[PDB]
RNA sequence: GACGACCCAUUCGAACGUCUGCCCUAUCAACUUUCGAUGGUAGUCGCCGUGCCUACCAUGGUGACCACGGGUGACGGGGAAUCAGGGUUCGAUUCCGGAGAGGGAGCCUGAGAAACGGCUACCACAUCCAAGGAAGGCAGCAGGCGCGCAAAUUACCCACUCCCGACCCGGGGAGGUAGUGACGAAAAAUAACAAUACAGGACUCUUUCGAGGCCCUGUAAUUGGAAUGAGUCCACUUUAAAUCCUUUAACGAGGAUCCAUUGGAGGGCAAGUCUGGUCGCAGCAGCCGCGGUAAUUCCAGCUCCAAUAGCGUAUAUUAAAGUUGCUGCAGUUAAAAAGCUCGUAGUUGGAUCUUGGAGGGUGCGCCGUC
């Protein structure tokens, strides 16, 4: 029970807990403010940038495909980031020097699937929603 | 500007057994949605929790006495609850139908003046039903005991009297302009 | 803040016992400076238009007041937010009504009509008793009235029948075991009762064990006890209820029994 | 269809020269009623006449055939004209008065501020 | 390690012969639709003890 | 019928003083004073207490019960969210207390201000000019730029609620009022009832065939009568005046509508042992995994499911998580008992001192029970 049991010993128990909390990764991340300091997105949920170039990335085994992302300079901190472009032929819709709204995978910062070193996805261009673009609700305005 | 939610969804989402149960409730009870059921599963859980707390308290305990009797009296005014119940030991052993049974909709069936939990809801939502001086359009209502008798069609909706119907009255003048003259 | 006296009251930060609603606006009246502390008072506006229903607007309350319609303790008061309080009289003449501001058993200034006499006099609790300037002595009552030359028996916490036209104490009651009492603050605010005991603390804080005409016992701080006469013999009107205090169950038992049948 | 005007919760209020009460208007089955019809109709129950029975509030209830409001009837037409909200007297053919609408006037005054005392000067400028 | 191509981008979407929309019915408003569900599912819905059956079956 | 004054108390306060409770950090362990650090003593100062300041005179005060130093997606609290219980996290933000009005510093007035819708200097910014001069501070209300993931009218009124003034009367972007407004929360429409017509099942009768029969649901066939606001609109209400709501004459439901959506249907996971197309391609896929020619995962339809005027997606954080474990963890081998012992703080500590009868609450028909 690895832990005193004296009526007094609040301070030891209280503090021993403070000492071990660290190992928790979610906890440490939060106390070290990692999201502000290391992370490309601010510690925000979405982030907008300009498209530098279009990449065809080489999906990891045992899968085999050309992935199709763009490389993006985030306006907020000039950070360089590669982001996936989802659905069929949607690259089509984003051109070099584009602008785009990027969002996390939903993986906690950890890349997704077979898609290697890509941690973000495009959501908007034409300020304009790949979904609405892919469907043809709305266009590549211009 | 204070506000609160009135319903709670179930922890979990796909438990055939629960889904069927809810569907039977919607059907018997001319309900509209799962929320319609969820709202009541929620109403009930709070009542039961209110009950359970009380039941853990000492009897005669000014707090247990004063609020227990009140919860009971409230639960009885609406007919939801009955006397032997009408103590806390019995609310603990209670269920959703008991509430669901007191809404308008099912009553307007329950005395002929609808012949369907169906008919009932469209009747209510369409202004042909007063609870004695007052139209009530809320198929969702909760008919209090000594209020059971005052439910009836309204003073003007046609049944309830009053001309015919913006569509019946159309039909009267539908046999009037052509078949009468030119 | 921080350079001067507040002039507004955010409603909601007003005292509960005025029972102003939650919606309506942002600000409550906020008592003028006067004879009663701001928490412990009842701005006329609340009396005229919040309890008595004579007024609707605040615009109306003012229109009433400028007539001169209303006197507090005998001497027309013309301020909307005048701070009236416990043992105050309030007399609306062309309407013939005399009211004494004294507590509910809730702890709410009660609407309590009194006779066309009585309205003459009020009972004040002595707060301090003083040798003023030139060697004269004075007493100071709760309601902030200073009377010189009082009679030498009168000591702090005693109460004192003031005339009212004239000022003038026209006797007194000592604070002694067995006196009738009115509770003017705290959990027990409004309960009336005999005494029993004063527990005394040096440094600070004296408690008064009170027993009611029902052998119900309770304590408050000496600060909260006001003497109003001799057991079974109040020196003023008491409101209906004789400051009794009944359990929420007893309260329910009275409410349903007196009506939906019992006349 | 007959109506019926019913005056609930009465107060004789001398210190504002008027009897003040709720107005409960049954209209069984249509809706409604005019403010003018209401004041006419009340005028004849309190032995007072129209021009002393202001009437206000009002909201027909739920579903039809009733409307609850509020009324006042004044003991001196003088007493009304003086205890009176002004907007109330304006509403019926006895009170009306000047508008603006307000920022033109504030602008005038702020123009006047520039000018030393005199200010009447600023009046001729507005 | 990327080099490669995209020539083929969007090859199936662009090769998938479009289909009409056809049409037909409206399905029903709120509670009424719940009612049809409950009768088709449960009243309907009698079931057999056929060792079961299905919702989106062909033959 | 139109305010001053002295002094005292009062009221609203103010300014200080008591304790007890605060985040992370030791890759911060000794700190604080010759420009007072702690104390004496006296004065000057202040509304006043006080190293506030100053002289002289002492050499103090604090720390492993975390001081000192540093950091900070720290204004503090009432509160909020997450519900076994324990807990876990947030709190700028409708109240309270504190702080500031471009940055810094100073000051006048006055009872109250170290005020910025006062002033004054510098410092940073910006503006007018006939170039000598001169005038300014939206972390007030609107609005605008920049910023970004992200946030409304350059609208009406002092009638309500209150405030101020010489004031019943004036004035209030306080505040109300409308406009924008799927933060989010409540109510819950887009169709109900027969009939034929049929499709059917427990019931009964019959040896069976077969027939009757109640409860009815669909499903058409159209019927058939039976309906209501969503819109629209005399009138009226609302209110300062309006709007909307809550009110209603005249209109407004046969479906091709007065036309409901958004995700899913291989497993977890609710729902295609589909049809066309492709053939580890495009795509799908949080995870496991699908697709390399009969693809129930794709791409489309068809059909079906689920939540439904809402639903998907991303993200902080919480629940789940007894994966931070007080309650309530594990450590022989899985991630984990220091090579061993001494040992201060800290924690932890044997036995033993004093031995029915009645009053009041709610059940059951004067009796009693608990």
Automatic annotation (TrEMBL), chain D:
PROSITE patterns: RIBOSOMAL_S24E. Keywords: Ribonucleoprotein, Ribosomal protein. The keyword Zinc does not apply. SUPFAM superfamilies: Ribosomal proteins S24e, L23 and L15e (SSF54189). Belongs to the eukaryotic ribosomal protein eS24 family. PANTHER family: 40S RIBOSOMAL PROTEIN S24. This is 40S ribosomal protein S24. It comes from Oryctolagus cuniculus (Rabbit).
């Amino acid at each position: 029970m690895g832990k005193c049991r004296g009526l007094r010993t609040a301070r030891k128990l209280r503090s021993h807990r403070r000492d071990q909390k660290w190992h928790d990764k979610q906890y440490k991340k939060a106390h070290l403010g990692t999201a502000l300091k290391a992370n490309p997105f601010g510690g925000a949920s979405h982030a907008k940038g300009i498209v530098l170039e279009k990449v065809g990335v080489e999906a990891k085994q045992p899968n085999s495909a050309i992935r199709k992302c763009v490389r993006v300079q985030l306006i907020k901190n000039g950070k360089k980031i590669t982001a996936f472009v989802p659905n069929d032929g949607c690259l089509n819709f984003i051109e070099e020097n584009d602008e785009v709204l990027v969002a996390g995978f939903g993986r906690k910062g950890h890349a997704v699937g077979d898609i290697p070193g890509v941690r973000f996805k495009v959501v908007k261009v034409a300020n304009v929603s790949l979904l609405a673009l892919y469907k043809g609700k709305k266009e590549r305005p211009r | 500007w204070v506000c609160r939610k009135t319903y709670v969804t179930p922890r979990r989402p796909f438990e055939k057994s629960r889904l069927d149960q809810e569907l039977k409730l919607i059907g018997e009870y001319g309900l509209r949605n799962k929320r319609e059921v969820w709202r009541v599963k929620f109403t009930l859980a709070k009542i039961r929790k209110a009950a359970r707390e009380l039941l853990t308290l000492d009897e005669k305990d000014p707090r247990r006495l004063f609020e227990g009797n009140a919860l009971l009296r409230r639960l009885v005014r609406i007919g939801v609850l009955d006397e032997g119940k009408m103590k806390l030991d019995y609310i603990l052993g209670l269920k959703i139908e008991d509430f669901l049974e007191r809404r308008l909709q099912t009553q307007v069936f329950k005395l002929g003046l609808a012949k369907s939990i169906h008919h009932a809801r469209v009747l209510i939502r369409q202004r042909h039903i007063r609870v004695r001086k007052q139209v009530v359009n809320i198929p969702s209502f909760i008919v209090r005991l000594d209020s059971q008798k005052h439910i009836d069609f309204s003073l003007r909706s046609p049944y309830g009297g009053g001309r015919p119907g913006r569509v019946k009255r159309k039909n009267a003048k539908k046999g009037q302009g052509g078949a009468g003259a030119g | 803040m921080a350079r001067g006296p507040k002039k507004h009251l955010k409603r909601v930060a007003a005292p509960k016992h005025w029972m102003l609603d939650k919606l309506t606006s942002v600000f409550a009246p906020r008592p003028s400076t006067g004879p009663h502390k701001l928490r412990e008072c009842l701005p006329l506006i609340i009396f005229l238009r919040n309890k008595l229903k004579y007024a609707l607007t605040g615009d109306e309350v003012k229109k009433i007041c400028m007539q001169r319609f209303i006197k507090i303790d005998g001497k027309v008061r013309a301020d909307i937010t005048y701070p009236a309080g416990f043992m105050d009289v309030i007399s609306i003449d062309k309407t013939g009504e005399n009211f004494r501001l004294i507590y509910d058993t809730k702890g709410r200034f009660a609407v309590h009509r009194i006779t066309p006499e009585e309205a003459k006099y009020k009972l004040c609790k002595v707060r301090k008793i003083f040798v003023g300037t030139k060697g004269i002595p004075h007493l100071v009552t709760h309601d902030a009235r200073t009377i010189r030359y009082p009679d030498p028996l009168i000591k702090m916490n005693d109460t004192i029948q003031i005339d009212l036209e004239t000022g003038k104490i026209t006797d007194f009651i000592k604070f002694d075991t067995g006196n009738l009492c009115m509770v003017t603050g705290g959990a027990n605010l409004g309960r009336i009762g005999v005494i029993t005991n004063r527990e005394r603390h040096p440094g600070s804080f004296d408690v008064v064990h009170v027993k009611d005409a029902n052998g119900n016992s309770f304590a408050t701080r000496l600060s909260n006890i006001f003497v109003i006469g001799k057991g079974n013999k109040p020196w003023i009107s008491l409101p209906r209820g004789k400051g009794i205090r009944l359990t929420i169950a007893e309260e329910r038992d009275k409410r349903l029994a007196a009506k939906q049948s019992s006349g | 269809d007959t109506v019926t005007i019913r005056t609930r919760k009465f107060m004789t209020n001398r210190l504002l020269q008027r009897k003040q009460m709720v107005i409960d208007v049954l209209h069984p089955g249509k809706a409604t009623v005019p403010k003018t019809e209401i004041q006419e109709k009340l005028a004849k129950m309190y032995k007072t006449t129209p021009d002393v029975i202001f009437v206000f509030g009002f909201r027909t209830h739920f579903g039809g055939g009733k409307t609850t409001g509020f009324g006042m009837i004044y003991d001196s037409l003088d007493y009304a004209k003086k205890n009176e909200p002004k907007h109330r007297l304006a509403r019926h053919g006895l009170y009306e008065k000047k508008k603006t609408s307000r920022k033109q006037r504030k602008e005038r005054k702020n123009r006047m501020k520039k000018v030393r005392g005199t200010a009447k000067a600023n009046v001729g400028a507005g | 390690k990327v080099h490669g191509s995209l020539a083929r981008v969007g090859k199936v979407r662009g090769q998938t012969l479009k289909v009409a929309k056809q049409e037909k019915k409206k399905k029903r408003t709120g509670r009424a639709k719940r009612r049809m569900q409950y009768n088709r599912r449960f009243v309907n819905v009698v079931p057999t003890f056929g060792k079961k059956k299905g919702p989106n079956a062909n033959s």
